[model samples]
Target: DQRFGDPVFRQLAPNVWQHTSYLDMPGFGAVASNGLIVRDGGRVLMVDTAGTDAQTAQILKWIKQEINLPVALAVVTHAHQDKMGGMDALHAAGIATYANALSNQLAPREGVVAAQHSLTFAATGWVEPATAPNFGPLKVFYPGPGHTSDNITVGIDGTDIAFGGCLIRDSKAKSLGNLDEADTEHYAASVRAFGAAFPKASMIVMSHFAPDSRAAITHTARMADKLR
Candidate 1:
């Protein structure tokens, strides 16, 4: 089944709906597809908004229906076009967008500059952050350089869920792809660091995998151990 068609609106717990939007993240040298969405009482806290402005708009409209509260927070998992691209629209709608300082720093890096340019071109409008308190939570920590020098996993503590933040994938394969920005030799080490920081996470979400399943957590930890 397509992960996000009916989009497994699974209840991780009561009142917590995981809207795993399936996206076709392109592998290399092509525009990739991605999955990102809102959570908790229908508030939109997306990891990434696909690539184009239209795609971002579609998500925003869908998220509104699911949320009882206004779309409060949009979290950019990393600094990738298919990942963090659609944030400007949500921000324009008065939503507060949160991205780690690492994301800002990593933006100027040579590896991601091309993708970031695509994001900027796609985002003709500059959406400013709302004055609202917060969307929910956006936290950033150094994971010792995995997907990118500054890639960090986002933890939704209230939900006991961790958004893998493009640093990892949730497939059974646990395959590595498009590592132009990642230190391949150090990727496994980074994964270990992520596991240590979020040792208590019961569920996980990813930037791809369409469904971006909870299995990402279990599968990833095992992969890291194997690498060791």
Candidate 2:
């Protein structure tokens, strides 16, 4: 059941780590994801939190075993409870947290809408509200709406890595989501803002899907841009 330490973690890029947890794939429940983690001098940074409290705790344990460096910070790709449900537990341990300012309210809205949509075709409830990130390496920008309205793709500058909150899909064939909470115009514009004006990223990591090369990111953005 625990394949994470088996030397088979999802390798999105050189240093990008993706450990996926299969939640309710059949639809009643929500899906979950674990994003990138980068190590610097004596610090470790986690990208997105997986679904449950149990998962987050387990990850923290693993982080300790892998590196003695303290967890400098944790970032939630969006505000999905699954992506951030473990924050309360992690924060209790005193780890720094950070997210887009808009994510505080927007993430819960996105997660709640997604959860509600998962259960009932018409039951539009999703994630709940919670504390915001206030620690660790900081990365935020003007505007980008890849997944949730507040999704903010972060860049791990120390490693020349970029985590595309929800804008960078695994494959171009994959549309953003089950529902486009925001308008298509906004979606495309956000992607452009992130991919074009963001940091010098050699690798692009995403929240929902897998990691990809900067070339793949540029290519994918080009495709979407053309469609736009």
Candidate 3:
């Protein structure tokens, strides 16, 4: 019944696919982590791999067999386990990884390997302007701090889809789950600013929130106020 093996997938936009896998959380029991399989010309781009290497293997297989797209690059939105846990698998597969300057700095500390390619922007603050990279039809940039100080968002040109990562909450999210590395004071503003940057991004995708078409970006901003 599984599409490729463990991590299941579904198309979200024209060339964007959402991959889902489960992981065990201490108190939340089995939690889902959403990955992405995007088509960039004839190749594929992986975004925020699954929680485990085995699941990531499934994604690779699905991409190769079903989508017939080679792995062009991999992008980890943040340094979180749910976002970059399977990064080593992509690296070992010889696929180039691209992350922000902050993610590159924080990932190594979390035992995550740095990407071969990165969007190097020298800005250290709560809210910085978007840093776009040339990668297919998607505009990838740092939208400011929300879930983490280095959280970023990916926008698809001519489409309302925005890969908001963990910065945006799920439709059912009651509150900002983890605040350990969250910039609580400016979290709301960050999300708000991100929305303003990509004001047309109506559909948002994030960790544990794939296959959901709800407006998660604005939802996160409103939810943050409740938490405070």
Candidate 4:
């Protein structure tokens, strides 16, 4: 049987799978973080990695054995460990990892491996236009600084599902987490920008806890507002 802190996967949509892994934080004990696996024909695009290299390897094996789709690409949402802890595993498997240019620059400094590919955004609040080549059906958006200055969100093209990473809070989140690198002053606006960019997004797959509705966007904005 699967235990807590182990990596698990659940189907979120016909083409999307949510991967959850656990990390033991100082004060949070074992905390679960979420990522995504989106199938694109014979290949699949991954967003974020498991909490550790071992856990990420498990996911890779599962994908190979169960999903049977080659992981064509991967995107790291930020520089946080929970987001890129298994970057080494991806690189070891010869997977091409992608992340915001800033994120790539910051990852090594944070003691993690940076992605192999860097995605350049036009500006702090830039959203990838529909016509842009966004790694097949994946659209990357940078909504300025929030959870982390390098944090970016990924949305599935033509779908309401968006991977909020840690920028958008889980529905049960009461406070803005890990403010050590957060842009508290602009967190609310950044989250609002995310909501604006994905106006059709009603289902947001957050990094921690369960997936939330679009209301999570409003809820996160409100929390950040109260913090400010």
- Tens digits of per-residue lDDT for model 3, 129-193: 34334467656767666788888777777666777788887767787887888888778887777
lDDT (CA) per prediction: 0.54, 0.56, 0.74, 0.86
Q: How high is each candidate's TM-score?
A: 0.68, 0.71, 0.87, 0.93
Q: Write down the TM-score for model 1.
A: 0.68
Q: For model 4, how does the per-residue alpha-carbon lDDT over 1-228 read when each residue is reduced to its tens digit?
A: 877766888998888889998887576578888999998988988999987898899999989998898898898899888999999999998888988889889987999888887777776555445323448888888988999999999888767698889988876779877788999899999999999988888889888868889888988999998767
Candidate 1 overall lDDT versus native:
0.54
Clashes of each: 5, 8, 0, 0
Cα error, residue 221 of model 3, in Å, equals 0.5
Using TM-score, give the best candidate's number.
4
**Candidate 1, residue 136: how far the Cα is off, in Å:** 3.8
Best-to-worst ranking by TM-score? 4, 3, 2, 1
Per-prediction RMSD in angstroms?
Answer: 7.6, 8.1, 3.2, 2.1
Higher-ranked by lDDT: 1 or 3: 3
- lDDT for 51 (candidate 3): 81
Which residue pairs collide in model 3, if any? Answer: none
As for model 1, its CA RMSD to the true structure in angstroms is: 7.6
lDDT of 3: 0.74
